[PDB]
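Assemble and predict.
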Amino acid sequence: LKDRYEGSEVQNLLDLAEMAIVTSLVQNNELKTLREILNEFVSINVFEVYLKLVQETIDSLISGMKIFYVAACCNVMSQEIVSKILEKNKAKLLELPLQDLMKCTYKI
Amino acid sequence: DWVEQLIL
Amino acid sequence: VLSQFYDREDWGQALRLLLLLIEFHYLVLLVAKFLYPIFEDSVATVIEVIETKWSNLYETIIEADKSATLLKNLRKKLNFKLCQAFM
Amino acid sequence: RRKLVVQWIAMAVDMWVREVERRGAMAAAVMGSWVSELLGRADQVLTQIAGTGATLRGGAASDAEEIASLRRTVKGLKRSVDMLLGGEMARMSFFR
Amino acid sequence: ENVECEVQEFMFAMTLFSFDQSYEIFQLHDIWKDLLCTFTVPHSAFYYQLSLLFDQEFALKCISKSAEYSLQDFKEKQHIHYLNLLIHFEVLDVLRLGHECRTNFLQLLLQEDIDFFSTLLRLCNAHSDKIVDSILSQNLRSCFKKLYCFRMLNAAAEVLYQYILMIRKRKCYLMVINVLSVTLTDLRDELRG
C-alpha cells in the first residue's frame, strides 16, 4: 500500500498484477516473473509472456483483448508488432497482420 | 495608420 | 480582401487574418475555410495558435461553405506542417 | 576534387542551419531558395563524381562509401533547408 | 574511313574514340593495357574503360547506357558512378529502391548526399503517400535536425522534439499538440506555467 501511494514486486509475487506489469513496461526479470506466476498457478498476459520466451494467432487475439481492457497496452501492442516484424524477416503472414497507423501503412 | 490599428 | 483580389501579398493577408482571429467562432471558421482554399515558420506558429484556440450558427456557416469541420481543420494543419517540413 | 568542394558546402550550410535554429530560440526568450537549389546541384555533382570513379582505368575508386555518406548528409541538409524555407522559419519563436 | 574498308569495326571505334560515331559503331558491332584487359574480358567492361579514359559527355552516356543494360563490386561501382554523374549534371531514389530490392556503402553515399538530397527524400515521401527507413533515421539523427526527422518519420518526431526541448518552447509545444491531434494537457500546463 505504501508503495502504490508513493508511486514491492517481490511482495506482489508472494488487476493489480496487470498494473505492475504496466509499470514494468529485463529478459531475466520477465523470466523470473513467469516462474513466479507458474508457482502461483491474466491468462492473456501469460500467453504473451510464453510467446516472448519462445497457437500464435490465439496468443495474438489474447493480447489484443488485453489491450482493449491504456499506455502500457499500446506499448505491449507495439512490442508484439516489432516481434512479428522480426519473425517475418504469405497467406498466413497476411492473417497474422489482420505512429502505429503510419507503421501499418508503410507495411502495406 | 490603418495597418497599425489592425495590429492593435 | 483587396490584397486577396490583387504570393507574398496573400501570405501577409493570411497573417493579418490570423492576427484578427486571435484578437477576437464564425470568424475562425471563415479563416479555416480560407486556409483550406489556399492549400513559413511564422505561418506555422499562427496555424498552431489557431489550433490551440479551437455554435449552431457556426455549423450552418460551415455547411454553407461546404456546399467534421474540426477534422477538416486538423487535416489542413497536418498538410501545412508537411509543407513546412518539405521546405 | 569537387567532392571536397561539396563537403565544404555541406559544412557551411550545416553551420548556417544551426545558426538560424539558435537565433530562433534566442528571440523566443537570409536563406533563399537558392540555397536549396545549390544543394540539389551538389547532389548531382556527387552522382557524377561517383560514376566517373566507378569506371576509372586501373580499377574502381576507393571512395564509394565516402561519397554515399556525403549524399546522405547533403539530402539531410536540403531537407532541413526546405523545411525552414517552407514555413518553419517564420514559426521559430512559437512553442511546438 | 579509307584503310578500314569485325576487326576494322573495332579499329574504327577505338580510333574514333582516341565520340558519337565511336559509341554508335561499337554498340552496333557488339590506354593500351586497358584495351588489352577489355579484350581479355570479351559490353560493361568497354563502357567502364571509356568512362575512366574520358574522366566527359561520351563517358557519362556510355556508362549510363551500360549500367541500364546490365540492370556486388560491379553493381556498387556502377551505382556510385551514375549517382555522382546525375548529382553533377531522382537518381538517388532510383538507386536506393533498386539496391534495397552493402549497407554501409549506402550509408556513405547518403553521407555524401547530405539540400538536394533532402528535396529528393521529400519527393519520395510524397510519392509514398525497413532497412532504408532505419538507415535514413540513423543518418538524420547523426530546427534543421528536428524538421528532417519529423518529415522522414511521416512518433520519432515527437520524441526528438521533446528531447531538444529538454519562442522555441512555444513553437515546439504547439507543433507537438497539432501532430497529436494526456500529452496535450501536459504541454498546455507547461506552456501556462
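Chains C and A do not touch (no CB pair under 8 Å).
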